[PDB]
Amino acid sequence: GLSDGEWQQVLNVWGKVEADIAGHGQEVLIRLFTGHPETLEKFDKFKHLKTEAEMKASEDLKKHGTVVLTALGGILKKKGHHEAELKPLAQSHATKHKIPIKYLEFISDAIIHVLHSKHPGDFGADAQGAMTKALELFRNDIAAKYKELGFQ
Numbered sequence: 001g002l003s004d005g006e007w008q009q010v011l012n013v014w015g016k017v018e019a020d021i022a023g024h025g026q027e028v029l030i031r032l033f034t035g036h037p038e039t040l041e042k043f044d045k046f047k048h049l050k051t052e053a054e055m056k057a058s059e060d061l062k063k064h065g066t067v068v069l070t071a072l073g074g075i076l077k078k079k080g081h082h083e084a085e086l087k088p089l090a091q092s093h094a095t096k097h098k099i100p101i102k103y104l105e106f107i108s109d110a111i112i113h114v115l116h117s118k119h120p121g122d123f124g125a126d127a128q129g130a131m132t133k134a135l136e137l138f139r140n141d142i143a144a145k146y147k148e149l150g151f152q
């Protein structure tokens with residue numbers, strides 16, 4: 001549950017991401033894969049990537065980064081009213097991709113890390129607080145759908 005002031009901060013921060021969605025998406029996935037290598041194993045189309053250089057050079061990874069952040073951005077712009085948008089993602093990630101909720105925690109923190117890295121001194125305490133709450137909300141609603149499906 002975010003205030004409108006907090007949603008305003010979230011969408012303000014998101015403006016930074018939308019100026020370069022592919023660059024942000026790329027670095028988020030790289031931070032995930034390098035920080036938590038077991039996550040790479042869930043992707044049959046990235047599992048071949050052994051080095052970060054190969055990751056950085058991968059146009060398909062950048063493409064998928066765009067798909068992921070486009071989807072997340074669509075969800076964030078709903079300001080919490082994202083049932084329709086979130087349900088198919090929860091379902092595909094639980095039933096098809098088999099992504100435990102822990103990995104969504106991982107990618108949440110990776111987003112926070114990337115924003116600080118690309119915008120040092122431009123991602124204030126209030127902005128981090130708001131973005132963090134937004135990602136927690138996202139994670140929590142996915143977690144509810146996971147519970148429904150009995151997915152661990």
Ligand code: HEM
Pocket residue numbers: 039040042043044045067068069071072088089092093097099103104107
């Ligand atoms: C903010 C969090 C995430 C968002 C918004 C997101 C979004 C998406 C979208 C839109 C797709 C393509 C459509 C679909 O299959 O549903 C997708 C596919 C996929 N996602 Fe995610 N995802 C997220 C987190 C993760 C994480 C943390 C993992 C694994 C560690 C993951 C694993 C996958 C895999 C394996 C696919 C299929 C890739 C392919 O073969 O094309 N996702 N995701």
